């Protein structure tokens with residue numbers, strides 16, 4: 001629907017040596033625009049956002065806010081004792097909505113399971129485990145922390161999101177259609193596998209389907225992943241009887257194409 | 268909780284023998300975040316590899332993109348090898364030349 | 368028993384309402400124009416009841432309580448005003464102090480783009496008061512420390528400019544030069560006032576009074592020291608009040624100060640006569656800009672009183688600031704062409720020497736050569752500006768900015784590229800503003816302008832600090848800021864950015880930009896190169912930037928631009944590493 005700005009925060013209690021105890025990636029929809037870790041200690045732009053037509057002090061404000069969150073996350077481990085090791089994750093951010101309105105997100109997970117949130121109307125951290133209470137009180141007892149979290153989600157995030165939409169519009173409206181290949185290989189005896197592959201496309205939404213005689217033959221089994229520049233790869237595979245490979249074609253739908261593209265077997 | 272990595276291997280552009288390209292190893296859906304990934308050329312570890320930032324999905328599981336510049340040829344086999352607390356031994360996935 | 372009634376009577380309704388509008392626009396910079404006019408009109412209606420009856424309900428409350436209370440009716444919206452909302456939870460006087468901490472010295476507010484003369488002239492004719500209120504609102508919200516009574520005078524000249532030119536034959540030829548002069552005067556005026564406020568708020572009344580003593584002694588060298596000190600005390604309260612957000616008192620006291628001066632010209636200066644015949648707002652403005660009086664024809668050397676005489680340590684100890692004040696006054700009145708910040712360095716140096724030597728074994732011997740210490744303090748600034756103006760004339764405006772951009776990235780690599788680009792643009796304007804002056808005035812011009820650029824840096828860095836060296840240069844001592852920044856060498860504590868396959872990631876949108884727009888891209892790239900090797904040479908950097916420019920040229924001519932960019936970016940990365948010697 002609406003594109004959002006979300007921060008993926010992680011802290012670990014026993015980091016491998018020379019790896020960060022705390023690190024952040026910032027995402028504008030499916031694009032990473034921000035990177036931060038506790039060894040380097042500054043927030044920095046990623047990819048094409050290095051070149052964004054940005055205002056002075058934008059990035060030093062990002063650095064300032066994440067340093068506060070760094071300390072908070074590490075303090076959370078002190079409030080636990082237990083034994084560990086622990087992993088603490090947070091998903092913090094906002095999404096633009098209707099009447100020029102912002103919808104915030106503030107969720108946390110411990111060793112891979114969601115256990116706590118921030119209530120934005122009340123300004124409190126809450127959850128049900130003993131660990132949520134321990135961490136939430138330690139954070140609650142921290143002078144100004146709840147206020148800074150309120151400002152971060154209710155003010156800074158939507159202002160950041162609206163700025164990047166204007167100033168990063170070239171990046172957000174980037175369009176790159178997939179390069180397509182259709183290949184077959186033998187599989188079980190009497191069977192071949194047909195693989196329809198989509199290389200280097202943006203945005204990530206894409207559909208692959210197989211046709212035979214112009215009618216649906218099936219979607220096949222799919223997978224999906226990123227390239228290093230934030231474009232994407234996808235493929236889908238269909239099992240067919242040996243000798244039938246040439247009866248099937250692949251059809252791809254993507255915002256980067258003027259219309260669905262039909263793709264034929266290669267020899 | 269613990270989650271075992273999924274491993275995919277694929278090229279950035281459609282592969283053509285003798286043409287410079289990039290090879291990806293995308294490891295996803297795992298927890299905790301400590302993980303070891305090597306890209307291999309004919310079984311030997313490639314030194315000149317880079318990776319994206321370790322990040323994570325809505326279900327809180329981690330993912331990580333490793334990649335290396337390469338020039339595929341008919342003879343060469345490339346693979347990705349991953350170890351993780353959830354695995355008794357390293358898991359090797361071979362580049363399938365975009366034909367699973 | 369009612370300050371609001373008191374200030375309303377002294378100032379009159381028009382100036383009262385204008386100052387009250389300014390006050391709200393500076394505190395609540397994001398609030399829409401119509402909300403502000405409603406509030407200003409309500410307070411003014413309220414003000415009218417207190418004059419009619421200085422005892423009606425709430426007329427006895429303090430100005431900050433009344434105005435703060437109104438602001439917290441709307442400023443409770445965290446969505447719009449950010450961390451300011453936390454101010455409304457507190458009481459006076461902290462509530463007010465909290466609001467001042469959150470005045471935004473960098474509001475991200477749309478550039479105000481001027482319409483055509485004909486459209487503005489119709490707007491002026493259609494609704495004159497609303498047009499002029501809009502002018503105050505837009506200036507005030509972008510400049511929350513703009514000197515408020517002077518802003519009144521800008522508005523009056525702005526009104527006068529429209530009145531005359533919208534009825535002229537060539538409207539634009541009458542009007543646009545006039546609006547551009549005011550626009551340019553206002554940023555300069557605004558920048559100076561920001562520095563006055565920083566000195567009072569971060570360094571205190573003594574630091575500000577030292578500045579005022581020096582400056583007034585330059586303009587009024589025939590006044591006795593007792594009269595200057597009196598003027599300094601008056602002026603310190605005015606600017607203390609304006610800078611504390613006390614705008615009605617500031618304007619009231621500034622008017623009183625202007626009348627005192629005009630009623631005492633024979634004790635102050637011979638340049639004031641006509642100024643003192645002007646209308647209220649013009650009078651104050653004329654006095655602030657008047658040309659220096661001539662200094663007395665034959666002044667003794669300073670040696671007698673401050674070096675040779677044996678009572679120096681006696682005189683110093685019983686009133687150190689009066690004695691250091693008298694030194695400043697005497698030195699300044701003899702040197703109207705020194706920059707004030709330099710004069711303050713001389714006086715601080717003198718102070719430092721007397722602190723040690725008046726403790727020493729033989730005080731008179733220990734400090735007999737103190738005036739020799741001034742020669743290096745004069746030589747360093749003069750050499751700085753000679754070389755930089757030499758550099759500026761060889762290189763020109765854009766390449767000169769690029770030289771300073773490289774210089775400041777090396778000094779403060781912790782700053783982001785937009786911040787560094789903007790700093791270098793502001794520093795580079797000192798080039799074209801001052802290097803074009805006569806030789807002898809080149810250095811005073813520069814120290815003064817550079818001290819306002821750096822203060823603007825410092826007040827923003829204080830809010831989001833990223834370099835310990837910047838924090839040290841900004842907080843250590845106001846008068847040594849510029850030498851402190853000059854002395855900064857390349858920062859060897861900065862861990863360089865690493866090159867990777869995505870270091871130059873571009874899309875095809877850069878091919879559609881104007882070359883002016885392309886220029887900031889090149890500058891951003893130049894920052895990024897320095898951050899990958901802070902010790903890089905000019906030559907390494909030119910080579911990498913030449914590669915950068917060819918990369919852009921290659922791919923923006925190419926048939927498949929997005930694909931070119933994917934394929935050539937990483938080649939540029941490797942070529943850039945080599946150019947920098949890795």
Ligand SMILES: O=C(CCCS(=O)(=O)NC(=O)CCCCCCCCCCCCCCCc1nn[nH]n1)NCCOCCOCC(=O)N[C@@H](CCC(=O)N[C@H](CCC(=O)NCCOCCOCC(=O)N[C@@H](CCCCNC(=O)CSCCO)C(=O)O)C(=O)O)C(=O)O
Nearest residue numbers: 574576577580593596688689691692714715718844845846
């Ligand atoms: O200088 C000062 C002020 C100092 C005060 S301060 O607090 O100390 N201020 C400062 O220190 C400010 C300094 C700035 C700071 C400096 C710091 C610098 C540090 C530099 C180094 C460091 C670097 C800085 C860097 C900062 C930094 N920080 N970090 N990094 N960087 N004062 C000067 C001297 O002191 C005062 C002198 O006092 C002298 C005095 O007393 N004057 C009197 C004189 C009287 C007078 O004239 N008063 C008039 C009043 C007006 C008037 O007209 N009056 C006349 C009306 O009266 C009526 C008389 O006439 C009536 C008449 O017609 N007849 C009379 C006759 C009566 C008969 C009496 N007879 C006799 O007397 C004789 S008897 C004869 C018989 O034989 C009648 O009434 O009948 C006036 O002037 O107002 C005075 O009042 O002024």
